[PDB]
Design a protein around this motif. Structure first.
Motif, PDB file in Angstrom:
ATOM      1  N   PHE A   1      -2.866  -2.070   4.028  1.00 38.51           N
ATOM      2  CA  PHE A   1      -4.013  -1.622   4.816  1.00 38.51           C
ATOM      3  C   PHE A   1      -5.271  -2.475   4.613  1.00 38.51           C
ATOM      4  O   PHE A   1      -5.465  -3.118   3.576  1.00 38.51           O
ATOM      5  CB  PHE A   1      -4.345  -0.152   4.517  1.00 38.51           C
ATOM      6  N   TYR A   2      -6.119  -2.467   5.636  1.00 35.20           N
ATOM      7  CA  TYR A   2      -7.325  -3.291   5.692  1.00 35.20           C
ATOM      8  C   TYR A   2      -8.444  -2.457   6.247  1.00 35.20           C
ATOM      9  O   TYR A   2      -8.267  -1.783   7.262  1.00 35.20           O
ATOM     10  CB  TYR A   2      -7.114  -4.538   6.576  1.00 35.20           C
TER      11      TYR A   2
ATOM     12  N   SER B   1      -9.196  -5.047   1.303  1.00 29.47           N
ATOM     13  CA  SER B   1      -7.993  -5.584   1.919  1.00 29.47           C
ATOM     14  C   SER B   1      -6.728  -5.435   1.097  1.00 29.47           C
ATOM     15  O   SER B   1      -6.764  -5.472  -0.132  1.00 29.47           O
ATOM     16  CB  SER B   1      -8.211  -7.071   2.254  1.00 29.47           C
ATOM     17  N   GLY B   2      -5.616  -5.262   1.809  1.00 26.46           N
ATOM     18  CA  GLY B   2      -4.291  -5.348   1.227  1.00 26.46           C
ATOM     19  C   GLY B   2      -3.932  -4.198   0.315  1.00 26.46           C
ATOM     20  O   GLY B   2      -3.174  -4.378  -0.636  1.00 26.46           O
TER      21      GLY B   2
ATOM     22  N   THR C   1      -5.251   3.140  -7.627  1.00 25.05           N
ATOM     23  CA  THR C   1      -4.986   2.006  -8.512  1.00 25.05           C
ATOM     24  C   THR C   1      -6.153   1.682  -9.428  1.00 25.05           C
ATOM     25  O   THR C   1      -6.017   0.860 -10.334  1.00 25.05           O
ATOM     26  CB  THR C   1      -4.651   0.730  -7.709  1.00 25.05           C
ATOM     27  N   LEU C   2      -7.308   2.291  -9.169  1.00 24.22           N
ATOM     28  CA  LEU C   2      -8.543   2.031  -9.915  1.00 24.22           C
ATOM     29  C   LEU C   2      -8.900   3.212 -10.797  1.00 24.22           C
ATOM     30  O   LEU C   2      -9.334   4.249 -10.288  1.00 24.22           O
ATOM     31  CB  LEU C   2      -9.694   1.742  -8.948  1.00 24.22           C
ATOM     32  N   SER C   3      -8.744   3.071 -12.110  1.00 27.57           N
ATOM     33  CA  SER C   3      -9.008   4.198 -12.999  1.00 27.57           C
ATOM     34  C   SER C   3     -10.481   4.590 -12.990  1.00 27.57           C
ATOM     35  O   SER C   3     -10.818   5.761 -13.169  1.00 27.57           O
ATOM     36  CB  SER C   3      -8.534   3.879 -14.414  1.00 27.57           C
ATOM     37  N   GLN C   4     -11.351   3.608 -12.783  1.00 30.46           N
ATOM     38  CA  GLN C   4     -12.773   3.856 -12.594  1.00 30.46           C
ATOM     39  C   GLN C   4     -13.172   3.318 -11.231  1.00 30.46           C
ATOM     40  O   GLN C   4     -12.540   2.391 -10.741  1.00 30.46           O
ATOM     41  CB  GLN C   4     -13.594   3.187 -13.696  1.00 30.46           C
TER      42      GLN C   4
ATOM     43  N   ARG D   1      -0.814  -1.079  -4.308  1.00 26.71           N
ATOM     44  CA  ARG D   1      -1.503  -2.361  -4.376  1.00 26.71           C
ATOM     45  C   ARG D   1      -2.987  -2.089  -4.434  1.00 26.71           C
ATOM     46  O   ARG D   1      -3.526  -1.357  -3.594  1.00 26.71           O
ATOM     47  CB  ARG D   1      -1.187  -3.230  -3.148  1.00 26.71           C
ATOM     48  N   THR D   2      -3.642  -2.696  -5.416  1.00 28.24           N
ATOM     49  CA  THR D   2      -5.088  -2.632  -5.599  1.00 28.24           C
ATOM     50  C   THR D   2      -5.833  -3.344  -4.460  1.00 28.24           C
ATOM     51  O   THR D   2      -5.485  -4.473  -4.107  1.00 28.24           O
ATOM     52  CB  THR D   2      -5.479  -3.276  -6.970  1.00 28.24           C
ATOM     53  N   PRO D   3      -6.866  -2.700  -3.881  1.00 26.43           N
ATOM     54  CA  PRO D   3      -7.656  -3.419  -2.879  1.00 26.43           C
ATOM     55  C   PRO D   3      -8.379  -4.647  -3.432  1.00 26.43           C
ATOM     56  O   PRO D   3      -8.893  -4.611  -4.565  1.00 26.43           O
ATOM     57  CB  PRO D   3      -8.686  -2.372  -2.434  1.00 26.43           C
TER      58      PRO D   3
END
Length: 100
Positions: A63-64, A29-30, A87-90, A4-6
């Motif tokens: 997570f938070y 978050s999350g 989850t973030l390529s950049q 899951r992406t923050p």
């Protein structure tokens, strides 16, 4: 497995017991997995001294992180949060809106 992406929120707060102090906050978050890199930036430069880094989880896979520190903003300086996660390529950079 789950990932899951923050969600990333950047904002300032004055503690009510000490109103002239000001804190820059990055609430991340999350997210899952919990592996993550988070920095506060001032004019693009990493802030090395960040007083508070509070990690928690709700469900075992959520997570938070609250990442914050005292700061003294001037109308010329630019602040941001930079987050790296699988989850973030950049790296994701979220700028602080000065009226927040």
């Amino acid at each position: 497995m789950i990932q899951r992406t923050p969600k990333i929120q950047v904002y300032s707060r004055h503690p009510a017991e000490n109103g002239k102090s000001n804190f820059l906050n990055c609430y991340v978050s999350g997210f899952h997995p919990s592996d993550i890199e988070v920095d506060l930036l001032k004019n693009g430069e990493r802030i090395e001294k960040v007083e508070h880094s509070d990690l928690s989880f709700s469900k075992n896979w959520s997570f938070y992180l609250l990442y914050y520190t005292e700061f003294t903003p001037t109308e010329k300086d630019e602040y941001a949060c930079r987050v790296n996660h699988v989850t973030l390529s950049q790296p994701k950079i979220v700028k602080w809106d000065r009226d927040m």
